[PDB]
Design a protein around this ligand. Sequence first.
Ligand SMILES: Nc1ncnc2c1ncn2[C@@H]1O[C@H](COP(=O)(O)OP(=O)(O)OP(=O)(O)O)[C@@H](O)[C@H]1O
Ligand SMILES: Nc1ncnc2c1ncn2[C@@H]1O[C@H](COP(=O)(O)OP(=O)(O)OP(=O)(O)O)[C@@H](O)[C@H]1O
Ligand SMILES: [Zn+2]
Ligand SMILES: [Zn+2]
Lengths: 145, 362, 96, 48, 184
Amino acid sequence: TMSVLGHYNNFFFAAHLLDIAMGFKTLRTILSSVTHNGKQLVLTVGLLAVVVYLYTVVAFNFFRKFYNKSEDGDTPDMKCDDMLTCYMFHMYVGVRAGGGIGDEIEDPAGDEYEIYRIIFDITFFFFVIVILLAIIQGLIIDAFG
Amino acid sequence: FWKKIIAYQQKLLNYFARNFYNMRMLALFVAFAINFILLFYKVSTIAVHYVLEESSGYMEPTLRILAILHTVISFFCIIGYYCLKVPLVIFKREKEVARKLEFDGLYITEQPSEDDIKGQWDRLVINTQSFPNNYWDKFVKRKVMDKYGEFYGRDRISELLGMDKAALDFSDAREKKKPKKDSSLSAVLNSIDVKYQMWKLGVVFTDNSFLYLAWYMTMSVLGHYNNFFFAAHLLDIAMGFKTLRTILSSVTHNGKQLVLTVGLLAVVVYLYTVVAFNFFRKFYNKSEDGDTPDMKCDDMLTCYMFHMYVGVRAGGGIGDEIEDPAGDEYEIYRIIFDITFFFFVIVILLAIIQGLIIDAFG
Amino acid sequence: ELRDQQEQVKEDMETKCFICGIGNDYFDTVPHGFETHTLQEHNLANYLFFLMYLINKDETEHTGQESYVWKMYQERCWEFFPAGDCFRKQYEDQLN
Amino acid sequence: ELRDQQEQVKEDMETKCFICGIGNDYFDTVPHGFETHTLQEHNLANYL
Amino acid sequence: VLLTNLSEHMPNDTRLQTFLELAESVLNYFQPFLGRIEIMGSAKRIERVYFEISESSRTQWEKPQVKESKRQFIFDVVNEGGEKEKMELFVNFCEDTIFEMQLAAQISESSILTVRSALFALRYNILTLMRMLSLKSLKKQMKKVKKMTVKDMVTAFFSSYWSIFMTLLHFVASVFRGFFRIIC
Ligand SMILES: Nc1ncnc2c1ncn2[C@@H]1O[C@H](COP(=O)(O)OP(=O)(O)OP(=O)(O)O)[C@@H](O)[C@H]1O
Ligand SMILES: Nc1ncnc2c1ncn2[C@@H]1O[C@H](COP(=O)(O)OP(=O)(O)OP(=O)(O)O)[C@@H](O)[C@H]1O
Ligand SMILES: [Zn+2]
Ligand SMILES: [Zn+2]
């Protein structure tokens, strides 16, 4: 079916490059590391989503003023006024950020919630960026072993 | 009245004991539904209001019904625990105290070390008449009497164990018989054993799982005053799903080592902060404007906070965030400083955490 | 590697005697046999206590066995240490 | 895997003779029996 | 030592077993102090040697530092060592251990409040709950349950557990307050 659709649109022929997994036994050794603990990998992503949702709840309840993402003072692009928007911001930006959500939300210095937000950022970096990704790494390594 | 109350109480107890686990799973499902609903709040304007906005218009009454249902299910889970799991805890405690009393003389030869709350609290149940209430060996007091009655005195053993001396002999001897109905209210309120129930409630209160369920109930109640307290019930996935236990055991297997690694990282960063505060203060200006300098290492505490907060999370270390050292008389020293910070903190210690998790898996 | 080394240490200790080197399976024919052998007959703590006692004891007061062990310890010969043999293995026929 | 291979090599060498293949337990009935057998009777250096 | 030697060299003598039960007390008293090892005797045979272990020596042996040293020695010998030099390393370790044990004997010459607060909190808070039963005032409850109602019975059943949960909350609050009072 994909080969037939390739005539109507030639870029459908790229789906046939997914056949390397089912055609080459060498790639099976590499891919088995991913697939050996696939359930654990999915559960790790679910746990990461739950933890990030808890962090988003905390930020939405206490640290809303630190989620302006607009350089101009005329219009504020507040990213945590809506619960769904704040959760999307967290999952999309903070997880991919090297240092966590604190790398992307502005400076907390000279504020009455400074220590609380410092703890927030440090714990986000430690649990999400460091530990859960380490869990995925260890799952792959343990599958190899 | 009497058969009806006893039978119906037993029926409700049996129902809740049977359905304890199903209700515990239903609580988690309702918590996930409530949080999925909560994912659609908006702050509306000052006056700050958290308003549930929805196009359907049905989801706010649904949220209220779900919150009430979650509270009811949490109360029912507490009841089911008390009906089902508490008897096993009481049986284990009664068996352990009996074994220590008989084969160790925990209250005859030795005494509790005065810092064991369990050992000090188990004193009450010894004198009670409802001992092995759940444990099968109902001859434990007689066994203790036989074992320790000679060296330590029959009377003293009986006083410790709450056993009578002359009542049994008198009942064996001359006696008078008169039928009496137990259904008198004074009789039932005397038949209930106050001291043994007090000890039982103490054990239940000190039980960890009962405390966890009480915390669950308290959070569910607080969820009515503030709906975002229902997010704390999402922490129950760890204690409700066995699949997540395999993932979390990797973290918890070497938790002490992970904590010590963080402590060591803090000490190393403090040493680096000491060096920077003594020699590299001029490189910690964090203000783009020349009018006002935001010096981050003039104060020792400020410099340590800057290090721990920014340099550790930085990909390349503190040198990624403190300005260029080129064309300075401390250039080589600061280059060594930055490279060593990156190598020891960013590379090695994080590698230690990674290896701890991997080794826990293995 | 460190974890494997610790596991190997504990496995060796639990599977063979430190002194004679005989496996636990041989001693386990009698119930609790390995524990009895390693805690009553071939205890390294007992050997250390014997060395301490022999050193502290006067040479003139030594018995024949003590003098034998003392001479071989002075000459640094460790043949008195049982290797591959024990009381049970020697007296299998008489004991059981 | 490299560490496991080295450990397996040393374990094989210490547990069985290179030539005859008999285990060390059989030779260890006589004290230092395995060392005597592998250094005096079945030495691969002696065969070379 | 004589009796132990006789019993161990003749395990199947009932006449000697009788003397063993006769001397059970003395043998039990001297059990900690009786040393026992096996050696390759001069007669090309395994011989069993009985000696005296001193109380000071045993205490110095079960000192924790000596135990850590023993664990380190065993780890080192098992990991990096050969069976040919095992009995030489063991004798060296024994000599060093004996020296440090003798030196230690030479030099050695002549929260409760937090637990009690938690126990008092349990006692007080449980007595508060038992006071309702001790009042013997449930005649009013009996009068109102003269009418046999499933709703009333279920309400009482839930109310008892709700009271237990409230008592637990009070107990936790009391424990926390006592903790702050103690730390302050
Ligand atoms: N010759 C031996 N002497 C003592 N133990 C031996 C000997 N040979 C093997 N073992 C084993 O070593 C164990 C004792 O070793 P170890 O010192 O580690 O004891 P432990 O129970 O872990 O604690 P502790 O450190 O307090 O002695 C014995 O139970 C036995 O299994
Ligand atoms: N046929 C054999 N010949 C020699 N060694 C053998 C033989 N079979 C088993 N072995 C084992 O191999 C050991 C010697 O191997 P190896 O060459 O590694 O010795 P080494 O002590 O590590 O050092 P070196 O490299 O200097 O010889 C012997 O001690 C013995 O345990
Ligand atoms: Zn042995
Ligand atoms: Zn050979």
